[PDB]
């Protein structure tokens, strides 16, 4: 009994008559490439991608962006062609390249990455650590504006916060400084959220440091709502992630519901959903910059919980489910002696009536 193949059968297209006149894969590498090309297409039969959780596969993106920067392409193409002409025709670069001596100027690369491609890498790096799922819940914002967050670890020492980097609570015991560039017509709102580590409510976060109504680059001049609170992870649970967000606002907005007491040590006072917050201010607020850092328990934390929050410090561990044993049988057949010890309740003799 044969069924009818549904649509394309993988090799159907090639003509087996006269095999000598078909080109071949002479290279193992070519084969490799064509193979992966095939592995990426959506076949009509049960496949690896299907059962292994492709993260929903196709998703129709809710894009809340800052609109794509307007550029004429012919200008770019020409200027680039010319830059290439100038760069290649130089005998210095040829002599240097042949002898394996050259260096690429990392700072300028950082500048170009920032200017063009970087804002796209940001998107998928945020996607990686899931800065989207927990905050905007369906929605992707492309990080248009460059965001530099930094903690001062000494008089001369600056700790950078890059998206995805690991930082210690010690350096986060102090307030950060921020760099981004805007003229003054500007109106900004900046946010620092702890995306996991909420003890009572798994779907809720902790606003650490919230700032509102900022002209240009002036951070001191923006009205602050939540004064700065150093990250307070738990000893057990590893590697929380912290998100720095930027929003443009059109008219200066003031919101009393969001306002918090000045010292504000209590934890239930800080309970947050980026979702609801952005629902409240949605029309006037457009998401802009993104920078996040990953942090795990460190010595300074004990000082926090006791001194600030007047609370005992929680310690968590890792529990792996007890190894599965089949039902014990009255006469285990053909089993080692130690079989008896798999169903052992506890290790201690028990003399029952004795």
């Amino acid at each position: 009994r044969r069924a009818a193949p549904l649509g394309p059968m993988p090799n159907e297209d090639i003509d087996v008559s006269d095999l000598e006149r078909l080109k071949k894969y002479r290279s193992f590498d070519r084969y490799r490439r064509r193979a992966e090309q095939e592995a990426r297409k959506p076949h009509w039969w049960r496949t690896y991608r299907e059962h292994f959780g492709e993260e929903s596969g196709p998703k129709d993106r809710v894009d809340i962006g800052l609109p794509p920067p307007k550029v004429s392409r012919t200008q770019q193409l020409l200027e680039r062609k010319q830059a290439l002409r100038e760069l290649r025709a130089n005998v210095e670069e040829e002599r240097a390249a042949r002898l394996q001596t050259a260096r690429i100027p990392l700072e300028a690369v950082r500048a170009e990455w920032e200017r063009t491609c970087g804002p796209y890498h940001k998107q998928r790096l945020a996607e990686y650590c899931g800065l989207y799922r927990d905050l905007f819940h369906g929605a992707t914002f492309v990080p248009r504006v460059p965001l530099h967050v930094a903690y001062a670890v000494g008089e001369d020492d600056l700790m950078p916060v890059y998206h995805g980097n690991e930082v210690t609570p010690t350096e986060a015991a102090q307030a950060p400084e921020v760099t981004y560039e805007a003229d003054e017509g500007s109106l900004w709102t900046l946010l620092l959220t702890n995306l996991d580590g909420h003890l009572l409510e798994p779907d809720a976060e902790y606003v650490h440091w919230l700032v509102t109504n900022i002209p240009g680059n002036r951070v001191t001049e923006g009205q602050e709502t939540c004064p700065y609170l150093p990250p307070f992870p738990a000893r057990g649970s590893g590697f929380h992630r912290f998100a720095f967000l930027l929003f443009k606002q059109d008219k200066r907005i003031d919101f009393s519901g969001d306002t918090r007491p000045s010292p504000c040590y209590q934890l239930a006072q800080r309970t947050f959903h980026t979702f609801d917050f952005y629902k409240k201010h949605q029309d006037a607020m457009t998401p802009a910059g993104l920078a996040f850092f990953q942090c795990r328990w460190d010595d300074s934390v004990t000082r926090v919980f006791h001194q600030l929050l007047d609370m005992r410090e929680p310690v968590f561990e890792f529990v792996r489910p007890p190894p599965y044993h089949p039902k014990q049988k009255r006469f285990p057949h053909r089993q080692p002696l130690r079989y008896l010890d798999r169903y052992r309740d506890s290790h201690e003799p028990t003399y029952g009536i004795y």
Binding site: A150, A152, E155, L158, P160, N165, E166, E171, E313
Partner: protein
């Protein structure tokens, strides 16, 4: 720990350093025992751990030997976050 006289001051202060994980906000050093179901042996285990912490602290010649097997990734990640911290500009 601060109130216990039966331990000398150097012992007091160094048992408060290595063990700071089991110290309590009331200044309490907390020991836990489980295995036996006869509380006698549990007491013996706690008193033994206590004698071992006091012994290891009281012996000044202990070099606290570091294993590179569990801490290699820690040293690598530490160096790597050190290369980012290494940026030198006066801030604040």
């Amino acid at each position: 720990l601060a109130s216990a006289d039966w331990i000398a001051e150097p012992v007091r202060l160094k048992l408060a350093v290595k063990h700071k994980n089991r110290i309590n906000r009331s200044g309490e050093l907390i020991l836990t025992s489980e295995c036996s179901r006869y509380q006698f042996r549990n007491l013996a285990d706690c008193l033994q751990k206590l004698r071992d912490m006091i012994a290891e602290a009281s012996q000044p010649x202990x070099x606290x030997x570091x294993x590179x097997x569990x801490l290699r990734r820690s040293r690598i990640e530490n160096m790597n976050r050190e290369r980012l911290r290494k940026k030198r500009i006066s801030s604040a």
